[PDB]
């Protein structure tokens, strides 16, 4: 094609993210009259999200996904998006990114500093905790060998609830669980399904601890080369795909508990009051480390009403 573009993904081929990326690619090919073709590179074949964000920066990869919270790697205050239990729901995630001074500034910095244009935002689910033994209460977290991604907010979730975290890339998790090198992991329901973690985890606890969005990102080096009509094709396709993407997650949060029960998983509902209480010293540490910018981002987010 005139523009042979590439979309790198950490997710695998059986995921919502992949389905939405397929929709995006098909729409772009059609509405560009075949001038743009977007090939898909899932399963972290190009590296993880941190790696793929670097590839968009240097222009060697055209599209990828990232969470708003992942930008805490560059702007520590952006950890606010994944401080456990701070963002209430997707409604708050959307307004936090687009409708706060903090979020509007973050989007500008991603462009100026990091070489990426934000095309759209989707919902990527609320993280829950799977394990090889029941989590009936916060006590069951104590000493649980909990795999986390290489992200400070997930490490802190594990630490503060009393678990023993082991960081590793998404691709390594299934084997870690299978072999009982670790006892559990935490991810939205849809990822537990996509990765078949349910094959290797007998229990699922509704910890409801971190809310993931998902950003459709394009390399500035690629977006600038597209004539403006093709920029619009890409943007409009990203927005259409993000709505579809969110709906896949919303619907699965209704449908997946019955799916996991049919696969033999036992679902628990621990009292979340002590989970939330346990984060109070973490929020204090966040404010100490990130200073007024962090206090301000928290204030801006805590002001958002979660009811549509």
Residue window 130-159: x/- pattern of binding to ligand NGE, with contact defined by CB under 6 A = -------------------x-x--------
Rounded least distance, CB 53 to ligand NGE, Å: 9
| 67: its two tokens | 């969470």
Six-digit token string for 69 = 């919270």
Stretch that binds ligand NGE, among 62-70, 157-165, 240-248, 258-266 (CB under 6 A): 62-70
- Shortest distance in whole angstroms from residue 254 CB to ligand NGE: 20
Question: What is the SS3 string spanning 52-93?
Answer: HHHHHHCCCCCEEEECHHHHHHCCHHHHHHHCCCCCCCHHHH
The residue of the chain with the least Cβ separation from ligand NGE equals: 10
CA-closest candidate to residue 39, choices 90, 70, 1: 1
* Smallest separation, CB 34 to ligand NGE (Å): 28
Q: How far is the CB of 30 from ligand NGE (least distance, A)?
A: 26
Both structure tokens of 22: 């397929």
Element (H, E) at 295: helix 280-302
Report, in Å, the least distance between residue 12 CB and ligand NGE.
9
Residue among 10 and 278 whose Cβ is closer to ligand NGE: 10
- What is the distance of C-alpha 246 from the center of its chain? 12
Rg (CA), the chain: 19
Q: Which residues ranging from 257 to 286 are in contact with ligand NGE (CB under 6 A)? A: none
Residue in 32, 128, 187, 219 binding ligand NGE, rule: CB under 6 A:
187
67 is in an annotated binding site: yes
Count CA atoms closer than 13 A to 250's CA, side-chain side.
Answer: 11
CA torsion sign for 44, 47, 51, 57 is negative
Compute CA 198 distance to the chain's CA centroid, rounded to the nearest angstrom.
20
Q: Which residues within the stretch 205-244 sit at the binding site for ligand NGE (CB under 6 A)?
A: 214
Candidate list 7, 10, 79, 152; residue touching ligand NGE; CB under 6 A: 10
- Residues contacting ligand NGE: total by CB under 6 A: 14
CB 214 within 8 A of CB 204: no
CB of 126 to ligand NGE, least distance (A): 12
Return the range that interacts with ligand NGE (CB under 6 A); candidates 61-69, 92-100, 216-224, 299-307: 61-69
Site for ligand NGE in 82-141 (CB under 6 A): none
Find the part of the chain contacting ligand NGE (CB under 6 A) among 65-73, 100-108, 260-268, 291-299.
65-73
70 near ligand NGE, judged by CB under 6 A: yes
- φ and ψ of 116, to 5 deg: -130, 140
Q: Is 127 annotated as a binding residue?
A: yes
User: Contact between 69 and ligand NGE (CB under 6 A)?
Assistant: yes
Cβ neighbours, 10 Å, residue 273: 9
Left, alpha or beta for 162 (phi > 0: left; psi -120 to 50: alpha)? Answer: left
Instruction: Give CA 76 to chain center in angstroms.
Output: 17
**Of residues 63, 65, 203, 216, which one binds ligand NGE by CB under 6 A?**
65
Q: Does position 24 bind ligand NGE by CB under 6 A?
A: no
Under the criterion CB under 6 A, does residue 67 sit at the interface with ligand NGE? Answer: yes
Does 10 carry a binding-site annotation? yes
What is the helix (H) or strand (E) element at residue 297, kind and residue range? helix 280-302
Binding interface with ligand NGE (CB under 6 A): 10-11, 49, 65-67, 69-70, 149, 151, 170, 187, 191, 214
């Amino acid at each position: 094609a005139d523009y042979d573009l590439k979309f790198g993904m950490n997710n695998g081929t059986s995921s919502n993210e992949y389905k939405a990326a397929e929709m995006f690619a098909k729409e772009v090919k059609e509405k560009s009259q075949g001038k743009i073709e977007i090939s898909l590179y899932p399963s972290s074949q190009l590296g993880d999200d941190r790696a793929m964000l670097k590839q968009l920066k240097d222009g060697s990869l055209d599209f990828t996904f990232a969470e708003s919270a992942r930008f805490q790697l560059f702007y520590p205050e952006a950890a606010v998006f994944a401080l456990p239990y701070v963002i209430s729901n997707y409604n708050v995630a959307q307004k936090a990114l687009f409708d706060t001074e903090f979020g509007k500034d973050l989007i500008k910095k991603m462009d100026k500093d990091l070489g990426v244009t934000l095309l759209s935002q989707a919902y990527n689910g609320t993280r829950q905790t799977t394990s090889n033994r029941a989590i009936n209460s916060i006590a069951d977290m104590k000493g649980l060998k909990l795999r986390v991604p290489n992200a400070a907010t997930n490490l802190a979730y594990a630490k503060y609830v009393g678990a023993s975290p082991t960081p590793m890339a998404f691709s390594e998790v299934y084997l870690a669980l299978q072999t009982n090198a670790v006892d559990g992991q935490e991810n939205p329901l849809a990822a537990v399904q996509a990765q078949k973690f349910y094959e290797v985890q007998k229990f699922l606890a509704m910890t409801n601890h971190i809310l993931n969005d998902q950003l459709y990102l394009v390399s500035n080096e690629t977006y600038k080369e597209l004539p403006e009509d093709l920029q619009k094709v890409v943007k409009d396709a990203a927005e259409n795909a993000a709505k579809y993407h969110t709906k896949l997650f919303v619907d699965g949060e209704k449908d997946l508990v019955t799916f996991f029960e049919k696969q033999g998983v036992k679902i628990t509902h621990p009292d979340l009051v002590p989970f939330k209480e346990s984060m109070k010293p973490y929020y204090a540490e966040f404010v100490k480390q990130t200073g007024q910018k962090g206090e301000s981002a928290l204030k801006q987010i805590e002001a958002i009403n979660p009811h549509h």
